[PDB]
Amino acid sequence: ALAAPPGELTLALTPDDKTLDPASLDRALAILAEHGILVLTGMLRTRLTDQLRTAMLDDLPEVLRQQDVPTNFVPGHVQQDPPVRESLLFPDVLLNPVVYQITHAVLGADARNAVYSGNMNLPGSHEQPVHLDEPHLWPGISHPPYCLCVDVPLIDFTLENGSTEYWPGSHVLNPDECYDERGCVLPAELERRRAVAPPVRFPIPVGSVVIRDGRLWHRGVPNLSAAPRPLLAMTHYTEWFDMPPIQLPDTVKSWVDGSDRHTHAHFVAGDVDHLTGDHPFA
Ligand SMILES: NC[C@H]1O[C@H](O[C@H]2[C@H](O[C@@H]3O[C@H](CO)[C@@H](O)[C@H]3O)[C@@H](O)[C@H](N)C[C@@H]2N)[C@H](N)[C@@H](O)[C@@H]1O
Ligand SMILES: O=C(O)CCC(=O)C(=O)O
Ligand code: NI
């Protein structure tokens, strides 16, 4: 049982750090290339994580009221987008200078965030199948990354409350007949991999940011605590990967648009309904 993020995957920062020195950036990139997952501790202030946690636990009842509750693979892994009210859209979350320094270095200067989503892992949730969030672009081909997932826990993640299982080094594996249509890893390839590089699961304190290859094998696991475990998710993509834009209110256009940290965004004159997208001119 691991008690903290492993040294091999971890870089420790303060919220005041606005760029990595060249040696830290080199280490960040070497970790993403070799392991496909990088844990950055001490990035986000309590003031932001408190407001986002509160907003998502306040919204959970509206999500559970829906006729079909949207879930990822298995019961208890609920799909919940964080709010896109002006008051809960934070430059240090959407446009984090350290996150974009890393994604610029891996994906290029034209890399863009195209995801503002979340994962609410409920008490008593089931085991997800091992999967990738974004696939390899062709079967049986080694190619570099085209996307980096940026995962922001909104409480302390523990072994008990459903810290995500990650498969280090799995992001480069793409043999023939390795994935099904849903992005789940075939059992034969899981067992081959398990024997060479088994998965890891570790606590991640709130304030941390996880950056990983969008193709990294991982799974949500049971939340065996008394409280829902909220996770905020973003994903940076190369410029040339087709994605629907994030719906944002035009109140944040001034600072989101024309930043050197790109967002694939559509700016809406009214209020955006993050929970159902049933707002006018959706
Ligand atoms: N890491 C961020 C998010 O990843 C997944 O969602 C992505 C989605 O992935 C689907 O969901 C499965 C993994 O749960 C994949 O196999 C695809 O079918 C992808 O197809 C979309 N183009 C973009 C979505 N952001 C998750 N579903 C979502 O809950 C999570 O917040
Ligand atoms: O929230 C988690 O730990 C896992 C969620 C997930 O990977 C997913 O839904 O794709
Ligand atoms: Ni996933």
Q: Could you explain how this protein is built, in words?
A:
This protein has 282 residues and is α/β, with parallel strands linked by helices. The protein has a single domain (7-268), classed as Sandwich (Jelly Rolls). It has helices at residues 22-34, 46-65, 91-94, 97-107, 187-196, 253-256; strands at residues 10-12, 37-41, 77-79, 112-121, 147-153, 165-166, 209-213, 218-219, 229-237, 246-249, 262-263, 265-268. Helix 1 links the parallel strand 1 (10-12) and strand 2. The termini are far apart. 22% of the residues lie in helices and 20% in strands. The strands form three sheets. Strands 1, 2, 3, 4, 5, 7, 9 and 11 form an eight-stranded mixed β-sheet that branches. Strands 6-8 form a two-stranded antiparallel sheet. The chain contains six helices and twelve strands. The site of ribostamycin has 12 residues, from strand 4 and strand 9. It is classed as metal binding protein. Keywords: non-heme iron dioxygenase, alpha-ketoglutarate dioxygenase, oxidoreductase, 2-oxoglutarate, metal binding protein.
List the helices and strands and how they pair.
Blueprint: E1 10-12, H1 22-34, E2 37-41, H2 46-65, E3 77-79, H3 91-94, H4 97-107, E4 112-121, E5 147-153, E6 165-166, H5 187-196, E7 209-213, E8 218-219, E9 229-237, E10 246-249, H6 253-256, E11 262-263, E12 265-268
Parallel strand pairs: 1-2, 4-11, 10-12
Antiparallel strand pairs: 2-7, 3-4, 4-9, 5-7, 5-9, 6-8
The chain binds ribostamycin (RIO), 2-oxoglutaric acid and nickel (II) ion.
2-oxoglutaric acid (AKG) binds next to β4.
PDB class: metal binding protein
Keywords: non-heme iron dioxygenase, alpha-ketoglutarate dioxygenase, ribostamycin B, metal binding protein
Assembly: monomeric
